[PDB]
Design a protein around this ligand. Structure first.
Ligand SMILES: [K+]
Ligand SMILES: [K+]
Ligand SMILES: [K+]
Ligand SMILES: [K+]
Ligand SMILES: [K+]
Ligand SMILES: [K+]
Ligand SMILES: [K+]
Ligand SMILES: [Mg+2]
Ligand SMILES: [Mg+2]
Ligand SMILES: [Mg+2]
Ligand SMILES: [Mg+2]
Ligand SMILES: [Mg+2]
Ligand SMILES: [Mg+2]
Ligand SMILES: [Mg+2]
Ligand SMILES: [Mg+2]
Ligand SMILES: [Mg+2]
Ligand SMILES: [Mg+2]
Ligand SMILES: [Mg+2]
Ligand SMILES: [Mg+2]
Ligand SMILES: [Mg+2]
Ligand SMILES: [Mg+2]
Ligand SMILES: [Mg+2]
Ligand SMILES: [Mg+2]
Ligand SMILES: [Mg+2]
Ligand SMILES: [Mg+2]
Ligand SMILES: [Mg+2]
Ligand SMILES: [Mg+2]
Ligand SMILES: [Mg+2]
Ligand SMILES: [Mg+2]
Ligand SMILES: [Mg+2]
Ligand SMILES: [Mg+2]
Ligand SMILES: [Mg+2]
Ligand SMILES: [Mg+2]
Ligand SMILES: [Mg+2]
Ligand SMILES: [Mg+2]
Ligand SMILES: [Mg+2]
Ligand SMILES: [Mg+2]
Ligand SMILES: [Mg+2]
Ligand SMILES: [Mg+2]
Ligand SMILES: [Mg+2]
Ligand SMILES: [Mg+2]
Ligand SMILES: [Mg+2]
Ligand SMILES: [Mg+2]
Ligand SMILES: [Mg+2]
Ligand SMILES: [Mg+2]
Ligand SMILES: [Mg+2]
Ligand SMILES: [Mg+2]
Ligand SMILES: [Mg+2]
Ligand SMILES: [Mg+2]
Ligand SMILES: [Mg+2]
Ligand SMILES: [Mg+2]
Ligand SMILES: [Mg+2]
Ligand SMILES: [Mg+2]
Ligand SMILES: [Mg+2]
Ligand SMILES: [Mg+2]
Ligand SMILES: [Mg+2]
Ligand SMILES: [Mg+2]
Ligand SMILES: [Mg+2]
Ligand SMILES: [Mg+2]
Ligand SMILES: [Mg+2]
Ligand SMILES: [Mg+2]
Ligand SMILES: [Mg+2]
Ligand SMILES: [Mg+2]
Ligand SMILES: [Mg+2]
Lengths: 128, 224, 160, 33
RNA sequence: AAUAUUUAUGU
RNA sequence: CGCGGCUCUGAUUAGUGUUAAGUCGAAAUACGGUUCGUGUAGUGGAAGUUGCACGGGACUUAUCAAUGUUGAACAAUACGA
RNA sequence: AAGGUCAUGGCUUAACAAGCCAAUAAUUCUCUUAGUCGAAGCUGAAAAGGCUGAUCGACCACAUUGGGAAUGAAAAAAUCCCAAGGCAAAUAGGUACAGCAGUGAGGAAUCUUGGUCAAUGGGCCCACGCCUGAACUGGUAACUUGGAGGAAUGAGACGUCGAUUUAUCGAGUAAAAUUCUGUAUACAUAUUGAUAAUGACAAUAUGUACAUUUGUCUUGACUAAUUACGUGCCAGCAGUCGCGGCAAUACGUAAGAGACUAGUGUUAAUCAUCAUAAAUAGGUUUAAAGGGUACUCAGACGGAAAAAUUCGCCCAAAUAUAGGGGACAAUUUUUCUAGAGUUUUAUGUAAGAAGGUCGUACUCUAGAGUGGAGAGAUAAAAUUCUGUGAUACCUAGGGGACGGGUAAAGGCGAAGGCAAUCUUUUAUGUAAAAACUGACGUCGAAGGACGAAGGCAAAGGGAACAAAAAGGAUUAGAUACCCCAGUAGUCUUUGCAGACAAUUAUGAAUGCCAUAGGUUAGAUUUUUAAUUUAGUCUAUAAAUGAAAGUGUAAGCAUUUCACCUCAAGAGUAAGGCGGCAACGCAGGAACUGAAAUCACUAGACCGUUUCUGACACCAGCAAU
RNA sequence: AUAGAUGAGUUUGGUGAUGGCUCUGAUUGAACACU
């Protein structure tokens, strides 16, 4: 592009790239609180197979998104106030959010010994 | 870019650097190739560099942006004009076999065209008439036509004597009991006979084919 | 104008790329000043203005050209002798910097930095063998000849 | 563009050209031609 | 020298 | 109070995205078995298909009925695979 | 012309003149978003870097929202006047915590309803002094930073544990133990913040004294670090690629190892990575991307030799007074001829247009034609034509559009496109010589003009071909490919329409780089054959390119305009503009992905070509 | 301010390109989880 073409404003910004968690990336928020609307199961994509525990959450902003329930076993159901954080289930389309396990109503895995911080589990407290 | 990269003009530079140091550090370098010191003071010559070639004729002084500046020019001499003029008036002068193979290249050392046409080393040819013509046209200030007549007439009188010797020599030899072989005239006719006969065979064979074809061409399928 | 310097820079590259012994250039004051600078740096061998045909090679520098009047000014042309050493041209690259679309000017503070291999402005540091030519009030000088004279100006070309 | 990729766009333009003819009457009533 | 039937499918 | 703009909602309806395991054909890639595409105008459950002009991103993929010659004899001390 | 003003200016007025700014949006309008800036914060190696616009300083605006004025040296108010709604109020006419602390609400998320005016600053005051939720201090929160948080010795307790080769390898100098120090901190003393005097609270120095926690992530590759067991495409892991289907270094436990540490990971965001919007500094033949075309306003760019002015550019800054230097740059002047043009009827030529015609075939009619049962179609047939006399062979008329040979790698126009012929008419372009003008040039957003076939509209024409509609076949079915027929339409005239593989998949233009063989229209010559100008086409050199290839350019450079920034959604939506319509111009976002994509290489395949072997086939015999 | 310029994983039967995505670096008036 010639110099004259750059004066008239030919260098426009590159097209935006969709974020992993638009609901959080839009308002510059690290997490958001929401009430579960449905707790079900999602089917993985072509290569993977199984059942992913997902929850349809209605964020405080108003948008309804599909979060992922990490860990083994959950205690949340309809009308449960759970905290949402960014992330995504790479093998589940539409699931672009996670749920903190040490959240308000969602309880951390009780029989977890590895990476307890990731699943909101207190120390076993055996020798204490 | 298909062709390979030839680094032959740098063999000394490359080879000398490879011999300056040893692969095993800390040791003295081994003796270099035996040719490294032979061409030490004989570097190659500059190649692949187009110069302005020699101009054998004045270049066009009118061209404002001429091309083919790095193109060798044609060699033209004043004799080229005369050679064409002579050999056109005497076309059969080319049938006289002339040798262009050179013996030692020194044939020009004994050519003094001020004496006449007959020189040392070279035969009496149309070239001798041109050089003699050129000499008169330059030294004696003669015109192209005048000098042409003079040198041309001296050429005839010499050619006449050569043709008269052949006849008188043969006739003279036979008066004292001298017999010769087959002359070119008889030898030429015998060859034509052998070739004509071969044509008679071909014509005879082809003539047969054509007449036979006519028989087959005509429809004689049913005989009544 | 500066367009003549760009055409001259590219022509000398094509001529050296073709391994030509001689080359012609339009006869202009601007072209001559850069040619003299290249000669003063050792990149070309000769400079001589003549007709559309090159002078005699044997007596190139001895060739005395005729006066340049208005009757033959249109035919005059500068003839520069190119240089080749060790299977390589001495004038390989002649990348220009100042183009007709933009005339890049440099200051003395920047030329001092560029002359030692450090970028400054729209220029880049000079490496081993590279040479930069600047058009100043004292003629078309070399970046190192302009540093001793303490002057800046228009940057013409960069020779590798 | 290759022939293969052009065929991808040949199928989009045909289905769109086909959709407008189907909806032409409906669009005319709504004053959207 | 200007001939010409029909041949779909394959986690 | 009217006109216009904007936001939300709307029975009903359209398009598109995603989703190994489904149904119907076999359009494309080989001359893909009607050359394939571009434009325009029609048409058919669907892919498709038809007219007209254009493009090669298809035919340079091209390989002899000129049928291929006694082109100056022979012999000598010349000549000697 | 007059007044006013230090002075200047329609600043003001009278009388005349019709100007002034702009033309590519000057000006105005609607929508979305935002307090602005600073090495102030973060970031990069860097760019007049990018992002933010907290704490710091400067500027702007606001004090429930809206509508307003005065006082004053100066509005520079949390003031004042009016209106509305909320709270409060009734005959009242207050209040708005975006002042400090604090409460509720919202949110993933951010503090004490403290002390003092001792210090610093301000207001009032003769003075003393009063007031100050500014400010100074204490409190809360690992939010961040800085520091401390312990050093030396420690060999046979001939003990303990963990593995496992049952005797090897580790926990392990690790622990205990011993010998020292007194760090944060506690206490005590002194000094100090402050002096004319005033100490809310604390700092600093010295002395003595005390040895107090681990936590977290990771361990297939990227990426430092391993086994065993359990689970068995299940449960689950995952930043990217991916792992799990019965002997998993990837999931879940146990142990070991790697690493950070009062922090450690995760999520969100910014810079860099990314030359990944490229001014420095990109690219568009085949991968995203050259506009259908070039005439052309604006605008960018563009010769030679001098001169004037600017003093641009440079010394050279600090937004530098005043100067110096003159190559270059800007406006301007005088000359020059290489660019671009004009004249001298070029030659050659399917650019274009008008008015007319020619011909080969076709088609219709006629002859009371000759002839007298078939013809045509297709791979084969059927529908169909024919006794109202067809096909075939003739004669005489009528009617439409088409353009055989010549013909070529050929030529002509801006492109689209242009091929029978006569006359009339039309702009460029090419060669050679002189002459002439003297930079008058190239590119070119927009506007306008032109723009294939098909199509719309009106009036004509209608032989032939042929979408559609319909019929006959083929086929498992057949809208279709094939066939009998056939309407729009192709043609003329006048408009609309503007989309193309509108192509050289390659914008236009300028300068430049080595050869060869053809070819087109000229020129020169010793016109036989060689030079030469402008085109075009093959094959190469240097070089260039991812390569294919190009090599009169896809090379080296330059000028200018258009266009591109992962795929898909999508050239789609909505509003708008153009059109009678069909449609065209312009042109997103949401949702969803880690890939889409180009060239080449070796194979395989082909209802692909040409060969080579085989009872593979043909033929014959025998058999099922 | 003269040391300051760096890569890695991932498209293909495969090779070489084009081109995005992610990782490696630094940081926040941050939030959450385990401490
Ligand atoms: K995937
Ligand atoms: K097809
Ligand atoms: K084009
Ligand atoms: K000056
Ligand atoms: K003049
Ligand atoms: K290139
Ligand atoms: K849409
Ligand atoms: Mg562990
Ligand atoms: Mg493309
Ligand atoms: Mg299949
Ligand atoms: Mg609805
Ligand atoms: Mg097919
Ligand atoms: Mg086909
Ligand atoms: Mg077609
Ligand atoms: Mg076309
Ligand atoms: Mg093909
Ligand atoms: Mg091909
Ligand atoms: Mg705002
Ligand atoms: Mg602020
Ligand atoms: Mg308030
Ligand atoms: Mg407050
Ligand atoms: Mg709350
Ligand atoms: Mg005070
Ligand atoms: Mg006091
Ligand atoms: Mg005070
Ligand atoms: Mg006082
Ligand atoms: Mg202490
Ligand atoms: Mg490793
Ligand atoms: Mg894990
Ligand atoms: Mg992969
Ligand atoms: Mg594991
Ligand atoms: Mg710390
Ligand atoms: Mg257009
Ligand atoms: Mg186009
Ligand atoms: Mg000056
Ligand atoms: Mg003149
Ligand atoms: Mg001219
Ligand atoms: Mg003519
Ligand atoms: Mg009859
Ligand atoms: Mg009849
Ligand atoms: Mg007619
Ligand atoms: Mg064309
Ligand atoms: Mg013809
Ligand atoms: Mg032409
Ligand atoms: Mg032009
Ligand atoms: Mg235009
Ligand atoms: Mg038309
Ligand atoms: Mg029409
Ligand atoms: Mg009509
Ligand atoms: Mg039909
Ligand atoms: Mg049918
Ligand atoms: Mg028909
Ligand atoms: Mg029009
Ligand atoms: Mg253009
Ligand atoms: Mg040629
Ligand atoms: Mg041509
Ligand atoms: Mg070529
Ligand atoms: Mg797209
Ligand atoms: Mg639209
Ligand atoms: Mg468009
Ligand atoms: Mg192949
Ligand atoms: Mg058999
Ligand atoms: Mg048999
Ligand atoms: Mg492949």
């Amino acid at each position: 592009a010639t110099l004259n073409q750059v004066m008239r404003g030919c260098r426009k910004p590159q097209r935006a790239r969709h974020a992993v968690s638009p609901a959080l990336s839009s308002i510059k928020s690290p997490a958001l609180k929401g009430v579960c609307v449905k707790v079900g199961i999602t089917r993985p994509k072509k290569p993977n197979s199984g059942e992913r525990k997902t929850a349809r959450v209605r964020l405080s902003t108003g948008k309804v998104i599909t979060a992922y329930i990490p860990g083994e076993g959950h205690n949340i159901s309809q009308h449960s106030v759970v905290l949402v954080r960014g992330g995504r289930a790479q093998d589940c389309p539409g699931v672009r959010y996670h749920l903190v396990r040490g959240a308000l109503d969602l309880a951390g895995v009780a029989t977890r010994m590895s990476s307890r911080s990731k699943y909101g589990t207190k120390k076993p407290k055996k020798a204490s | 870019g298909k062709g390979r990269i030839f680094q032959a003009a740098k063999v000394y530079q490359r080879a000398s650097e490879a011999a300056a140091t040893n692969i095993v550090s800390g040791l003295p370098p081994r003796n270099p190739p035996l040719w490294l010191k032979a061409i030490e003071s004989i570097p190659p010559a500059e190649i692949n560099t187009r110069p302005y070639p020699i101009q054998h004729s004045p270049p066009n002084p009118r061209a404002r942006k001429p091309r083919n500046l790095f193109r060798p020019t044609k060699i033209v001499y004043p004799e080229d004009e005369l050679r064409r003029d002579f050999y056109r008036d005497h076309p059969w002068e080319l049938a006289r076999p002339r040798m262009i193979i050179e013996l030692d290249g020194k044939d020009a050392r004994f050519l003094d065209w001020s004496k006449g046409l007959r020189q040392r080393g070279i035969p009496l040819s149309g070239e001798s008439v041109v050089q003699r013509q050129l000499w008169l046209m330059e030294n004696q200030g003669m015109t192209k036509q005048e000098a042409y007549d003079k040198a041309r007439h001296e050429f005839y009188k010499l050619r006449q004597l050569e043709q008269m010797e052949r006849r008188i020599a043969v006739e003279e030899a036979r008066m004292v009991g001298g017999y010769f072989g087959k002359d070119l005239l008889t030898v030429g006719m015998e060859l034509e006979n052998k070739t004509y006969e071969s044509w008679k065979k071909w014509a005879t064979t082809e003539i047969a084919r054509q007449e036979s074809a006519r028989a087959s061409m005509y429809t004689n399928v049913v005989d009544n | 104008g500066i367009q003549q310097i760009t055409n001259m820079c590219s022509h000398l590259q094509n001529a050296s790329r073709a391994r030509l012994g001689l080359t012609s250039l339009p006869n202009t004051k601007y072209n001559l000043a850069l040619a003299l600078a290249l000669h003063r740096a050792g990149f070309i061998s000769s400079i001589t203005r003549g007709g559309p045909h090159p002078p005699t090679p044997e007596a190139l520098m001895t060739y005395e050209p005729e006066p340049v009047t208005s009757a033959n000014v249109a035919t005059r042309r500068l003839w520069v002798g190119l240089k080749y050493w060790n299977e390589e041209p001495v004038l390989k690259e002649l990348k220009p910097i100042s183009k007709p679309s933009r005339l890049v000017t440099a200051s003395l503070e920047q030329l001092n930095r560029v002359a030692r291999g450090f970028p400054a402005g729209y220029m880049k540091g000079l490496q081993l063998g590279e040479c930069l030519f600047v058009n100043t009030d004292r003629g078309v000088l070399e970046v190192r000849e302009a540093v001793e004279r303490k002057v800046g100006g228009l940057v013409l070309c960069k020779v590798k | 563009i290759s022939v293969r990729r052009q065929k991808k766009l040949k199928i989009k333009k045909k289905k769109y050209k086909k959709l407008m003819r189907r909806t032409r009457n409906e669009r005319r009533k709504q004053d959207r031609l």
